[PDB]
Design a protein around this ligand. Sequence first.
Ligand code: CL
Ligand code: CL
Ligand code: CL
Lengths: 163, 163
Amino acid sequence: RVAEQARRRAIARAIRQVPIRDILTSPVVTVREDDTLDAVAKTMLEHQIGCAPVVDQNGHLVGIITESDFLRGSIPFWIYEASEILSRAIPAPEVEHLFETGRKLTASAVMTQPVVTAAPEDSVGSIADQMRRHGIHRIPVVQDGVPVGIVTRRDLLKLLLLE
Amino acid sequence: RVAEQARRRAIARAIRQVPIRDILTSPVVTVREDDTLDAVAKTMLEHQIGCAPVVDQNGHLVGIITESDFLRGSIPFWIYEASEILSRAIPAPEVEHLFETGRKLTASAVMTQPVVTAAPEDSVGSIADQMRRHGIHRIPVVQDGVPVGIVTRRDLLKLLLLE
Ligand SMILES: [Cl-]
Ligand SMILES: [Cl-]
Ligand SMILES: [Cl-]
């Protein structure tokens, strides 16, 4: 019983010392702050992702955008996935109005500012601590100014408990 | 300005009246309460899902299991995705011990009980209300005792704000 605990303790400590870059196993997909929401939705759906770093024209991080952010512009992100299903609920000219609005607004209009960022050489444990300390759900990873990923609470729960 | 608000109001109202069964657009994948965690991991990774209803031998819902639940048995789910990366952190006999444990524990040993369930004829608004009121992140949809889906907070945020 005691030895089992020592065993568990050592695994947990090892896991906290894993560098962030080791858990960034997907390619980073970003969007431009000037991309229209229509283009962002296409990009997200085409790569099967629900959030993305927003960068300026020269590739520097300026914000984060998620599906839920579309509601800040009064657009439900689902319109890009299932307009036919939603057209059963909402009349056609109103659906078209949502699309027209998505073609006008940009990522910059609804993105958020990240409260904290991490570097690829930071440890899993240090990022977990950030996550719990600010009670947030996503943290962008930046290497030399350039986004190289977003770490989510779901990613970390594959490795360790979060308080 | 006033006219736009009426427009947005009617859209928001329409969205709350969409029946749940309209948003269950993916096929339900379940696991058995007696499946080993090794098999559960395999199922979830084959189907690219992070949670699943747990059913009994005759198919009735008995629980919910997610990747994070593996930690309840002291196994990091990531071991099933990236054991080679984890082995740079953890000696090989210890990783093997994790695998051994996963082949012994079953879904029933780590699954959770759902505080609330929904029926497919219920509305989006009503399940959204359930989410916030119980402050939960996932709700199983059941049609005649049989799971037909799991609705998450992420799903709902494609449609409407929560609290
Ligand atoms: Cl609008
Ligand atoms: Cl998350
Ligand atoms: Cl163990």
